[PDB]
């Protein structure tokens, strides 16, 4: 008949764009984030085809977190007079974990030098009784700049004008596929940028039950993501009572060493409840049996091997970096009181899987304690198989971020349409 | 589970004829031709697409759960052992 033009029709297309930060003295620079009740609109009669393994939000979040990490280490002290020949002895005469290492150092005047000491961990020094820092042959050290805090705070990811973020409200939702309950939103909820390898902490819980999501479960080279419907409380502690001592290494440059420890030297550790973990493992086995035979045997085991970052549950509690031995949890074999996990502490950190640059971490005085809620798991399956066995695994932060952005997606609005109508222009 | 078989066993194709090696499997399948006392080489990947650097005569086709590779204008140098691997499961192959 005739063609007519409509401006402002509801139509969207898949696209990728830069999303900015809205968030209600911090590493993630939330002061630059714009201030953020947000409205959410329900869409009926609609089924959007979602995919969580190929969305661009995770890549942009990864590069933005890396950029925020990098730009917050520029102003603060560059510790590269500390690559000298240390002389270390035992702290007491658990044994051999701490060392008293003395060395020479520079001072405010170029022609003068001083002799100082500090308490180092066994994981930060390498023997040449003369030791040296672990990474003076591979990278340079910059201090962690005590004026900032490492505590994560929620961050939103909001879209520009002309774009929208679709959400899936299906409770029992698989990683990929249609969502019969799509809604729209300007931007997401608060996401805490927490770093961990084997257990997910301070995350978002499932609504209905435990969910299993992997890109292709038949391929053993891809990890399995497990989400709990109820959290598992875990208490981590650092019994030692440290004292921090400040050392001047130049004009306006300060190095924060460790004076000593008051009282007794005790091992840092984390506690989990046995019965709740047993129930959680039973639920996980019941859900895992759906992707295999109904009579197959399930097993769990210690990590196979690798670096210290992937073989141990790694995180930070209040500014100290914990690596915890988790081989007491995955100890089971399923056929159809508390648990204490010894931990170790490290200060020289190679973060984001980069081998070029490293970071220090000043000692924090007082006793440190954390209470956190385990929400998820990352697993791998041994190939060559009944009797499927699963090991803990991790090391890639995109798996950490993907467990939060599995329901969101970004779309672009196209407000032009042409339609047949009987009207004729004058 | 993954079940995959390669029935033809040994063949007796002659020079200048067309040969076909068939197999059945589920999942991604790849064809390798190994000469005696040498490392394997990839001919066709995903069971339909041929890697760059192999002559265009080698062609493999998939239908349902049955795959097979056909070679036409056979040359004397093509007397090797041909086998198909899904993910981590391999069969002895055909010679």
């Amino acid at each position, epitope marked *: 008949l005739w063609v007519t033009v409509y401006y402002g029709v509801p139509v969207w297309k898949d696209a990728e764009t830069t999303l900015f930060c809205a968030s209600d003295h911090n590493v993630w620079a939330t002061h630059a984030c714009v201030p953020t009740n947000p409205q959410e609109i329900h869409l009926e009669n609609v089924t959007e085809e979602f995919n969580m393994w190929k969305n661009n939000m995770v890549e942009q979040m990864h590069t933005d977190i890396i950029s925020l990490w990098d730009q917050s280490l520029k102003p603060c002290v560059k510790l590269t007079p500390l690559c000298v020949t240390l002389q270390c002895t035992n702290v007491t005469n658990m044994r051999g974990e701490l060392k008293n290492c003395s060395f020479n150092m520079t001072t405010e005047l170029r022609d003068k030098k001083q002799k100082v000491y500090s308490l180092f961990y066994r994981l930060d020094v390498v023997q040449i009784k003369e030791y040296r820092l672990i990474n003076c042959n591979t990278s340079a050290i910059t201090q962690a700049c005590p004026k900032v805090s490492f505590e994560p705070i929620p961050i939103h990811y909001c879209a520009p004008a002309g774009f929208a973020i679709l959400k899936c409200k299906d409770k029992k939702f698989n990683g990929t596929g249609p969502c019969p309950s799509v809604s729209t939103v300007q931007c997401t909820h608060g996401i805490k940028p927490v770093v961990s390898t084997q257990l997910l902490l301070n995350g978002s819980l499932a609504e209905e039950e435990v969910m299993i999501r992997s890109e292709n479960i038949t391929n053993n*080279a891809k990890n399995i993501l497990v989400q709990f419907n109820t959290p598992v409380q875990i208490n981590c502690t650092r019994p030692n009572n440290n004292t921090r001592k400040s050392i001047r290494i130049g004009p306006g440059q300060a190095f924060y060493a460790t004076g000593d420890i008051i009282g007794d030297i005790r091992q840092a550790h984390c506690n989990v409840s046995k019965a709740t973990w047993n129930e959680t493992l039973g639920k996980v086995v019941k859900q895992l049996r759906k992707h295999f035979g109904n009579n197959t045997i399930i097993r769990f085991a210690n990590s*196979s091997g690798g670096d210290l970052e992937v073989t141990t549950h790694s995180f930070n509690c209040g500014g100290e970096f914990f690596y915890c031995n988790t081989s007491g949890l995955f100890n089971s074999t399923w056929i159809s009181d508390s648990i204490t996990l010894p931990c170790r502490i490290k200060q020289i950190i190679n973060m984001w899987q980069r*081998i070029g640059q490293a970071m220090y971490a000043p000692p924090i005085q007082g006793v440190i304690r954390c209470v956190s809620n385990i929400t998820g798991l990352i697993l*791998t399956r041994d*190939g*060559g198989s009944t009797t499927e066995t699963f090991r803990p695994g991790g*090391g890639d932060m995109r798996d950490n971020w993907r467990s939060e952005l599995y329901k969101y997606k970004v779309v672009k609005i196209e407000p032009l349409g042409v339609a047949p109508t009987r009207c004729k222009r004058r | 589970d993954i079940q995959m078989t390669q029935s033809p066993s040994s063949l007796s194709a002659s020079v200048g004829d067309t040969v076909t090696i068939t197999c059945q499997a589920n999942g991604y399948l790849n064809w390798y031709q190994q000469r005696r006392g040498k490392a*394997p080489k990839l001919l066709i990947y995903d069971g339909s697409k041929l890697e760059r650097g192999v002559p265009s005569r080698f062609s493999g086709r998939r239908w349902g759960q049955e795959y097979n590779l056909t070679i036409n204008n056979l040359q004397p140098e093509d007397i090797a052992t041909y086998f198909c691997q*899904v993910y981590e499961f391999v069969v*002895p192959g055909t010679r």
Partner: nanobody
Amino acid sequence: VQLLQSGAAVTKPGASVRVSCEASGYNIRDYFIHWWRQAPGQGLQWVGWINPKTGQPNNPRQFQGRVSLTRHASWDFDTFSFYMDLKALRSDDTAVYFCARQRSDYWDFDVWGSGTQVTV
């Protein structure tokens, strides 16, 4: 893209053998490395992969507790060395060992190693 291999090794029963590959020609950290072994007059047998970025291996139930996979990068991350250790040589461990590069999710190994003869 070129890999390398070590010479043939002869070891007594109840000993340990070490086989090394070396990949110099490409971005090593972005592709897995797989190991295979072939018995005389038999098809290929799967040995597990190793992730170059983190080093975590994955071995089947047959080789659990007997095989170790490690990698050691060098300065500037230009070359890599991938090792394979076998703990207790048995009567029927004789085979030829290859190292392969998985290009993508299809599990298609375009580049293979020269091979090593292991005899007890």
